[PDB]
Amino acid sequence: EQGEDITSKKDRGVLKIVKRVGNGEETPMIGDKVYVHYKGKLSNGKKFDSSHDRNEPFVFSLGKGQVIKAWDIGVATMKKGEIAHLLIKPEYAYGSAGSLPKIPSNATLFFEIELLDFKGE
Numbered sequence: 001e002q003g004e005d006i007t008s009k010k011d012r013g014v015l016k017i018v019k020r021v022g023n024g025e026e027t028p029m030i031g032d033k034v035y036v037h038y039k040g041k042l043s044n045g046k047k048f049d050s051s052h053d054r055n056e057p058f059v060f061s062l063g064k065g066q067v068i069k070a071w072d073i074g075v076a077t078m079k080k081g082e083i084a085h086l087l088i089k090p091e092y093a094y095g096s097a098g099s100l101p102k103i104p105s106n107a108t109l110f111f112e113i114e115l116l117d118f119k120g121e
């Protein structure tokens with residue numbers, strides 16, 4: 001329950017720590033194509049997911065809600081080369097409905113994210 005509160009409502013739903021600083025000043029804009037590696041888990045550590053388990057960069061369009069809200073918020077704060085940890089309350093992840101079978105109701109999630117690169121499509 002440590003980290004910078006990076007939510008808009010300042011409700012501590014998404015807590016962020018920079019583990020490795022990136023390069024430059026620039027962070028990605030909404031609509032940028034983003035390339036990451038990540039490892040992620042449920043706080044109840046019975047499900048761990050990883051891009052490394054394919055060794056393939058995970059790619060998505062930032063701010064489009066193609067991923068959980070906490071990602072769109074979180075990756076937008078990141079500099080290229082940055083590694084960050086996000087602790088995520090259910091309101092910014094899968095909420096009260098969850099996403100069975102992977103995600104139970106009201107789950108807290110953790111991710112380690114490396115931002116590799118972003119480009120304007």
Ligand SMILES: COc1cc([C@@H](C(=O)N2CCCC[C@H]2C(=O)OCc2cnn(C(C)C)c2)C2CCCCC2)cc(OC)c1OC
Pocket residue numbers: 038040041042047048049059060066067068071099102103109
């Ligand atoms: C609920 O469905 C999934 C959720 C995730 C994982 C997850 O929650 N995400 C995957 C990495 C991006 C953030 C977040 C998420 O938005 O996933 C939904 C998702 C999966 N692929 N996509 C692409 C279409 C962009 C979105 C969890 C993390 C905790 C440990 C268990 C898995 C990976 C998945 O497979 C890669 C999922 O299945 C499609």
